[PDB]
């Protein structure tokens, strides 16, 4: 199999509307936000404009191929693939994808999509000039699926807060926390998951 | 073959999703930014709004033909394009010109759109004689050097003959350099083109 053969197979057997739930087990979606820049802070409207890389990983076994005498990985446009219906439940603007809408697909069926997103969020920006700074809370989760269809996870990573952050930014990152919250309501047997991203930042001086 | 025959063949055998890797060798992509205008400079937020021509060239042997035209104009939607992106970008690149590329009979693709984009740059001391040096890092978003090789056409250090005389800013020097880094983890090298725009206010 060559790159063209792999990409044709993916395109022809493309079911982007179909969730790749194998043996009725949920799709394990792993989300991790890596902050690049903090552009605008509006004290009047209590808003914040952030630039961040959204590392999204999951497995789609139907995309898998034999790696023997074939490429190990291929770049596939997300329009040909199923993607999780992830959204920030508290977002005030539509997420703007800045980069080519391409995902990296491994021969084992693993999909790695990492777009750069420019988005506005509701933030209590009072005291951005203070030592403690301001904290931005982003609640990311599936818009229509529960934990039994899409499971969401933040990764074990906690030592990279400013590794991707622009040195030329007017703001400075203090602390980034991405925690998993699993809540099971009294009504319903299925659990409900979300990744709570806390972005603590202050103005340089 | 006439223009219609060449364009039909390109359209019918169109694989824009397929990287034209010939004999497992990477696609040699040549990028060169030619600055047309510097519109807004926000020293507070360290942002810069610029207009530039992105001369992108690569070879796609599957497009080659040959008493026929030497070159044809093909819309980029019918062609594969490299997944080039500025890591230093704050805004989505806005293409101002008709989205057409020039394809030569040998398979060479020449795409040069005019792009309006905002960047995070140290615009500190734009009014000073030394000016501000705004650096942009362009590279493939998903491919490594063994799939796509990114190269700067010039070095430069050339200023500009294309830059508007009616702009509020003035170009001092434009420097485009190739950076190839091979990490200890991984055997494949990782490439990028670092653009460096030195400019100042006229007064």
């Amino acid at each position: 199999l060559d790159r063209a053969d792999i990409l044709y197979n993916i395109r022809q057997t493309s079911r982007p509307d179909v969730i790749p739930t194998q043996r009725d087990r949920p799709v394990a979606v792993s989300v991790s936000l890596k902050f690049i820049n903090i552009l605008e802070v509006n004290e009047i409207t209590n808003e914040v404009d952030v630039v961040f890389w959204q590392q999204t990983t999951w497995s789609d076994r139907t995309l898998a191929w034999n790696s023997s005498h074939s490429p190990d990985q291929v770049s596939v446009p997300i329009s040909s693939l199923w993607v999780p219906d992830l959204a920030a439940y508290n977002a005030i603007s539509k997420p703007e994808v800045l980069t080519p809408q391409l995902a990296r697909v491994v021969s084992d069926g693993e999909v790695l999509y990492m777009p750069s997103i420019r988005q506005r969020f509701s933030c209590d920006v009072s005291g951005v000039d203070t030592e403690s700074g301001a904290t931005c809370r982003i609640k990311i989760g599936s818009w229509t699926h529960h934990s039994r269809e899409i499971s969401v996870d933040p990764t074990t990573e906690n030592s990279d807060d400013s590794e991707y952050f622009s040195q030329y930014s007017r703001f400075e990152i203090l602390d980034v926390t991405q925690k998993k919250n699993s809540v099971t309501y009294s009504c319903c047997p299925e659990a409900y998951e979300d990744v709570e991203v806390s972005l603590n930042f202050r103005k340089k001086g | 073959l006439d223009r219609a025959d060449i364009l039909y063949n390109i359209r019918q055998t169109s694989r824009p999703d397929v990287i034209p890797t010939q004999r497992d060798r990477p696609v040699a992509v040549s990028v060169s930014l030619k600055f047309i205008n510097i519109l807004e400079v926000n020293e507070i937020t360290n942002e810069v709004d610029v207009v530039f021509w992105q001369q992108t060239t690569w070879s796609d042997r599957t497009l080659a033909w040959n008493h026929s035209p030497d070159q044809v104009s093909v819309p980029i939607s019918s062609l594969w394009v490299p997944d080039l992106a500025a890591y230093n970008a704050i805004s989505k690149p806005e293409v101002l010109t008709p989205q057409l590329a020039r394809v030569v009979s040998d398979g060479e693709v020449l795409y040069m759109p005019s792009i309006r984009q905002r960047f995070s740059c140290d615009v500190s001391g734009v009014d000073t004689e030394s000016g501000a040096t705004c650096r942009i890092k362009i590279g493939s978003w998903t491919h490594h050097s063994r799939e796509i090789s990114v190269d700067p056409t010039t070095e430069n250090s050339d200023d500009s003959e294309y830059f508007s005389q009616y702009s509020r800013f003035e170009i001092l020097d434009v420097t485009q350099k190739k950076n190839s880094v091979t990490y200890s983890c991984c055997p494949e090298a990782y490439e990028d083109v670092e653009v460096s725009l030195n400019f100042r206010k006229k007064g």
């Binding site: 995902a103 790695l112 991707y164 | 990782y190």
Partner: peptide
């Protein structure tokens, strides 16, 4: 790893980053 600071590298090496 410097790979993790690169977007192309990060998605190319899930085992490392």
């Amino acid at each position: 790893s410097g790979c993790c600071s690169n977007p192309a590298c990060r998605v190319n090496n899930p085992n490392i980053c």
